[PDB]
Amino acid sequence: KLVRFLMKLSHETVTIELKNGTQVHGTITGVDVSMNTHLKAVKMTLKNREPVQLETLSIGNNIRYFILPDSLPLDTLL
């Protein structure tokens, strides 16, 4: 469902907000079955701190929120 939609839209640019407050916003390299997924050029903003541009960041289910882009129609995953 949601994991299948993330695997379908796992090439666009999205933001993953972790439970520790680390918000990695960037292109998705690949979404796995679990929440451990690799991203590309993610500007991981730390909790009340600056961002770090990581070309390869792999996530455990610490990544809680996922602000997805508009590359997903209502019947694209329905």
Binding site: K1, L2, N61, Y65, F66, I67, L68, D70, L74
Partner: protein, 68 residues
């Protein structure tokens, strides 16, 4: 199951307010749920200030409660 389908129908027809376990009270259209409560919400204003998120995906460990 049927209660989750009714909650998804109420979220599609109205503004459902889901208060997740990350203190995120989101009023808006919850697009889909899951058996592990992997919830995708379409165009929902979430208060952690109700900032609008066009599509938000949350886990069932990080979710707490929902309401119509």
């Amino acid at each position: 199951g049927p209660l989750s389908v009714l909650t998804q129908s109420v979220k599609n027809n109205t503004q459902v307010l889901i208060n997740c376990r990350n203190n995120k009270k989101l009023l808006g259209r919850v697009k889909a749920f899951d058996r592990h409560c992997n919830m995708v919400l379409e165009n929902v204003k979430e208060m952690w200030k109700d900032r609008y998120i066009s599509k938000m995906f949350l886990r069932g460990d990080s979710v707490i409660v929902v309401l119509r």
